[PDB]
Design an enzyme around this catalytic site. Structure first.
Site, PDB file in Angstrom:
ATOM      1  CE  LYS A   1      -7.712  -1.754  -3.914  1.00 39.73           C
ATOM      2  NZ  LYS A   1      -8.506  -2.845  -4.540  1.00 39.73           N
TER       3      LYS A   1
ATOM      4  CG  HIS B   1      -2.310  -0.837   1.028  1.00 42.57           C
ATOM      5  ND1 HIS B   1      -2.412  -1.907   2.673  1.00 42.57           N
ATOM      6  CD2 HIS B   1      -2.993  -0.812   0.260  1.00 42.57           C
ATOM      7  CE1 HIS B   1      -3.217  -2.607   2.173  1.00 42.57           C
ATOM      8  NE2 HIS B   1      -3.765  -2.033   1.054  1.00 42.57           N
TER       9      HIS B   1
END
EC number: 4.2.3.-
Length: 215
Positions: free
Chosen positions: A110, A80
């Protein structure tokens, strides 16, 4: 026989090979969307060979290389990126050259569409990017050169963000990171367990992929 078994049995060999390799270079792409452009991907868009979409039933803009460079089966490893909520567009733009790079080891990733999620929710405060990592070799083993390239890449992301003065976000509770990653964190849902909390993090920290990324 598996991705993780290979990492375990070749733990020192992979580290030793990696640390001797020259610095990676990533040729950054310029013809890429900015953050608003990303949000507008809609049903389908294309940029630098990455397929983009922002469907109405999801809250992320997804990017996937039409022709993936990793041939192995996904083994759960992902990163992340957490930045200050107000800085997501600036952070996306700063990283866009790398994230769309022909040299990026990340086939699929994403970014959260900040407009679709509640401002107080954790999804707004951190982990606004996800990078999926996939073993490069067809036999689903990571090669040393791929591990090196992945680590170099992540470290380039960290330096670009800090050089741009991006403020760190709130790292997810479920993730782990070393003191020198201000934005990046690691998660693997396949290897984290049922215990959550401190126990999941301690388990993550022992993961050979994570140790190879950090030591």
């Amino acid at each position: 026989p598996s991705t993780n078994k290979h990492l375990k049995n070749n733990f020192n060999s992979l580290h030793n090979q990696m640390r001797k390799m020259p610095v990676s270079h990533f040729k950054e792409a310029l013809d890429v969307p900015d953050y608003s452009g990303m949000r507008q991907s809609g049903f389908f868009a294309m940029s630098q060979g990455f397929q983009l979409n922002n469907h109405g039933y999801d809250v992320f803009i997804h990017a996937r290389r039409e022709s993936p460079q990793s041939q192995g089966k996904f083994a759960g490893d992902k990163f992340h990126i957490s930045v200050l909520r107000d800085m997501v567009p600036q952070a996306f733009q700063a990283l866009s050259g790398l994230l769309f790079s022909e040299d990026s080891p990340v086939d699929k990733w994403k970014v959260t569409d900040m407009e679709k999620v509640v401002q107080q929710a954790r999804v707004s405060l951190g982990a606004q990017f996800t990078l999926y990592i996939k073993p490069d070799q067809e036999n689903s083993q990571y090669s040393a050169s791929f591990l090196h390239k992945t680590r170099q890449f992540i470290e380039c992301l960290e330096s670009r963000l800090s050089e741009n003065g991006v403020i760190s976000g709130q790292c997810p509770e479920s993730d782990v990171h070393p003191e020198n990653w201000k934005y990046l964190s690691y998660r693997n849902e396949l290897r984290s367990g049922r215990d959550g909390g401190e126990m999941q993090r301690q388990a993550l920290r022992e993961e050979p992929f994570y140790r190879l990324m950090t030591e």
